[PDB]
Amino acid sequence: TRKTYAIYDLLDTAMINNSRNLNIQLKWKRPPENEAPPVPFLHAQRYVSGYGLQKGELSTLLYNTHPYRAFPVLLLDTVPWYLRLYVHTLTITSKGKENKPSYI
Amino acid sequence: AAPLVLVLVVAVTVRAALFRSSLAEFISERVEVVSPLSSWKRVVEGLSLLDLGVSPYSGAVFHETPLIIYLFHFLIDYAELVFMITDALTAIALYFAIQDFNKVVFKKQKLLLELDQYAPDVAELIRTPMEMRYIPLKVALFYLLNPYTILSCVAKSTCAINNTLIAFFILTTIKGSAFLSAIFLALATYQSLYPLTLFVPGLLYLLQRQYIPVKMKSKAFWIFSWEYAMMYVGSLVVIICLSFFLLSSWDFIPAVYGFILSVPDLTPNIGLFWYFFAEMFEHFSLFFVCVFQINVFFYTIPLAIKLKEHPIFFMFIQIAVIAIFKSYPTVGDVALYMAFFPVWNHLYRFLRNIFVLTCIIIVCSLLFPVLWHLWIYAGSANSNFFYAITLTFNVGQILLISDYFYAFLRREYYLTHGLY
Numbered sequence: 001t002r003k004t005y006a007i008y009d010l011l012d013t014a015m016i017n018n019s020r021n022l023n024i025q026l027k028w029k030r031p032p033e034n035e036a037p038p039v040p041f042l043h044a045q046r047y048v049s050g051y052g053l054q055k056g057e058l059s060t061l062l063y064n065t066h067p068y069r070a071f072p073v074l075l076l077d078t079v080p081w082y083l084r085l086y087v088h089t090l091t092i093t094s095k096g097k098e099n100k101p102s103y104i
Numbered sequence: 105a106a107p108l109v110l111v112l113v114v115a116v117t118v119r120a121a122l123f124r125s126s127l128a129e130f131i132s133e134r135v136e137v138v139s140p141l142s143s144w145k146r147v148v149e150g151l152s153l154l155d156l157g158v159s160p161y162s163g164a165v166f167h168e169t170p171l172i173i174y175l176f177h178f179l180i181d182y183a184e185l186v187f188m189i190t191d192a193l194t195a196i197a198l199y200f201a202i203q204d205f206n207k208v209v210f211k212k213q214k215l216l217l218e219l220d221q222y223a224p225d226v227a228e229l230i231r232t233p234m235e236m237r238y239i240p241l242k243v244a245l246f247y248l249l250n251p252y253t254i255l256s257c258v259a260k261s262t263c264a265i266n267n268t269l270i271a272f273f274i275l276t277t278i279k280g281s282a283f284l285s286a287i288f289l290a291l292a293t294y295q296s297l298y299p300l301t302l303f304v305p306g307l308l309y310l311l312q313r314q315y316i317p318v319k320m321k322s323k324a325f326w327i328f329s330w331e332y333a334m335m336y337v338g339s340l341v342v343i344i345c346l347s348f349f350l351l352s353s354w355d356f357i358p359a360v361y362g363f364i365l366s367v368p369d370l371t372p373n374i375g376l377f378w379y380f381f382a383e384m385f386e387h388f389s390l391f392f393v394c395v396f397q398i399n400v401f402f403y404t405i406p407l408a409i410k411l412k413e414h415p416i417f418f419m420f421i422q423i424a425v426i427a428i429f430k431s432y433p434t435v436g437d438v439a440l441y442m443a444f445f446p447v448w449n450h451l452y453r454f455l456r457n458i459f460v461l462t463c464i465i466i467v468c469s470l471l472f473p474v475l476w477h478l479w480i481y482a483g484s485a486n487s488n489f490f491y492a493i494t495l496t497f498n499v500g501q502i503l504l505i506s507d508y509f510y511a512f513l514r515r516e517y518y519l520t521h522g523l524y
């Protein structure tokens with residue numbers, strides 16, 4: 001996104017020198033709902049499915065918020081040895097239908 | 105026979121109904137019914153791993169032999185049909201084995217009756233064809249309709265397959281067939297290491313059937329024993345070497361036999377090894393695991409000493425000891441030696457402490473799921489509750505087996521010396 005930045009060159013004597021300190025004050029409050037920026041195109045959350053101390057599921061939700069563009073993603077999972085995984089139970093369901101990863 | 109067909113039909117119908125029920129998933133995940141070496145989910149996982157190019161023995165989930173993976177590669181479909189067929193085949197093998205054993209023991213009894221070797225008045229202890237008519241049918245009925253076996257086959261555990269192998273070993277041994285008995289014993293030793301202890305009962309029964317005196321000075325005994333031992337060892341070596349080539353690697357030997365002998369999982373079971381090694385000082389871990397795995401093979405020789413002339417009871421006691429002291433015991437393993445109870449039900453009059461032990465076994469079995477749920481899902485119980493249940497269950501099993509052994513000894517003593 002096109003972002004505008006204000007530069008405070010500390011190497012400039014005309015900005016900060018021995019005669020004064022610099023204290024940048026910014027006025028910012030939470031914008032109203034109308035002025036809120038759009039949600040980022042990619043975000044994800046992770047959680048554990050089920051209850052008890054015998055079995056469960058490590059579920060990851062991957063959100064694509066782009067209205068019309070689909071992009072690949074690369075998911076990396078590292079699970080310790082005491083959480084014995086069964087790869088035959090690995091399901092990737094997007095929009096309610098099975099999704100086949102390009103590379104597993 | 106018609107009653108055998110009726111029992112087979114009833115058992116198959118019950119198994120199919122439980123297969124199509126909503127309790128199949130609940131049963132499939134029971135720690136009492138499945139084990140790290142026998143779970144069906146692990147078979148599916150090890151089959152799926154091969155599709156990814158990953159050797160199934162590189163992980164810590166798959167612990168089954170290459171023969172199982174070859175069988176279930178072709179037969180991944182119709183798995184429930186496969187397990188129902190294995191249960192029916194075990195029932196058939198046990199039925200015919202016991203039917204032949206009854207004839208053999210009746211011929212022996214008639215021989216010592218003609219020789220008047222028994223006591224003058226032991227008519228009550230005398231076995232009659234009328235009482236032995238339905239023993240083969242009851243043997244197949246105590247296995248097919250056992251709740252343990254029904255659960256073990258609905259959960260789709262390879263324990264049913266290993267039980268079928270042991271049953272066919274018993275049948276072939278009872279029907280002569282030294283070659284087939286050696287092959288089936290090698291196959292049983294392939295799936296689980298412990299069934300190698302049945303070598304002594306099989307050899308003793310074969311020698312008795314072939315009328316070779318089991319004496320140190322005897323040479324025919326040594327010749328036949330050497331042939332049987334060589335046949336068994338060759339059949340096991342050939343199986344190991346052949347199944348090496350399935351994945352062209354030796355990694356299955358650790359994942360199966362080192363798993364069986366070293367107990368790395370420490371996952372709850374009806375056994376006595378899960379907690380002993382979870383709650384254990386690492387100083388004596390090797391010593392105590394060595395002692396506990398010696399325990400299974402400990403009694404075969406002294407039992408052979410006492411039961412030299414009674415090899416089938418020796419085999420039954422050995423099967424029971426294996427099922428009790430296995431590293432990863434299963435209710436399916438326990439159900440194999442409870443199919444022999446109708447054979448030894450003529451020992452009932454000399455059986456003490458039968459009601460209490462049966463009640464204890466029933467209580468422990470019903471209490472396994474309840475206390476497991478309280479510990480794991482409810483959270484209001486510890487592992488101590490489940491450990492206590494396993495202790496009580498195994499004590500009941502041990503006392504029941506020793507009780508049948510005592511009844512057998514009492515009957516032999518009365519037959520020899522005189523009942524009052």
Ligand SMILES: CCCCCCCC/C=C\CCCCCCCC(=O)O[C@H](COC(=O)CCCCCCCCCCCCCCC)COP(=O)(O)OCCN
Binds near residue numbers: 442461
């Ligand atoms: C399904 C998940 C959990 C279910 C748990 C159930 C599993 C229990 C399975 C096996 C446990 C059995 C262990 C001991 C087996 C004894 C073998 C046996 O046959 O001994 C027999 C003796 O039987 C007994 O003494 C035991 C009976 C006394 C108590 C049992 C009956 C009450 C229990 C019922 C509770 C449940 C009822 C529900 C509806 C049935 C010998 O009989 P016999 O020799 O034929 O008599 C004629 C004499 N010539």
Ligand SMILES: CC(C)CCC[C@@H](C)[C@H]1CC[C@H]2[C@@H]3CC=C4C[C@@H](OC(=O)CCC(=O)O)CC[C@]4(C)[C@H]3CC[C@]12C
Binds near residue numbers: 175179182185186190
């Ligand atoms: C292999 C031994 C040591 C242990 C397993 C027991 C076998 C003797 C049994 C158990 C399951 C049986 C199988 C169960 C199902 C079938 C399918 C059946 O054919 C079909 O129904 C296929 C139909 C189709 O494919 O269209 C042929 C027999 C077969 C292979 C059976 C052959 C004998 C098997 C392997």
Ligand SMILES: CC(C)CCC[C@@H](C)[C@H]1CC[C@H]2[C@@H]3CC=C4C[C@@H](OC(=O)CCC(=O)O)CC[C@]4(C)[C@H]3CC[C@]12C
Binds near residue numbers: 344354
């Ligand atoms: C069944 C009875 C009659 C013995 C038969 C002996 C051979 C058929 C087998 C049994 C054990 C096998 C061995 C078991 C373990 C290994 C380690 C293996 O090396 C590894 O990959 C390391 C494995 C590890 O230790 O974790 C090479 C094959 C070898 C020597 C095997 C070679 C073939 C052996 C000797």
Ligand SMILES: CC(C)CCC[C@@H](C)[C@H]1CC[C@H]2[C@@H]3CC=C4C[C@@H](OC(=O)CCC(=O)O)CC[C@]4(C)[C@H]3CC[C@]12C
Binds near residue numbers: 297357358366
């Ligand atoms: C079909 C039957 C007759 C096979 C008989 C062979 C087994 C008795 C052998 C074959 C492979 C052996 C296992 C190979 C590797 C290990 C790991 C080892 O633990 C370690 O990692 C320690 C290594 C070290 O001490 O340096 C403990 C013994 C054990 C389970 C061995 C126990 C004995 C096993 C199961």
Ligand SMILES: CC(C)CCC[C@@H](C)[C@H]1CC[C@H]2[C@@H]3CC=C4C[C@@H](OC(=O)CCC(=O)O)CC[C@]4(C)[C@H]3CC[C@]12C
Binds near residue numbers: 297366381390393399
């Ligand atoms: C194979 C049959 C015919 C022989 C009888 C087997 C048992 C009586 C004993 C003999 C040697 C023992 C093994 C010797 C060495 C080891 C390595 C040992 O490795 C470890 O230290 C890891 C396990 C742990 O320490 O808890 C595990 C036990 C084990 C497999 C032992 C298990 C019990 C065994 C197989």
Ligand SMILES: *[C@@H]1O[C@H](CO)[C@@H](O)[C@H](O)[C@H]1NC(C)=O
Binds near residue numbers: 016
């Ligand atoms: C830099 O120093 C001079 C001399 O003291 C001072 O007048 C000037 O204000 C200083 N710069 C800034 C940005 O204040």
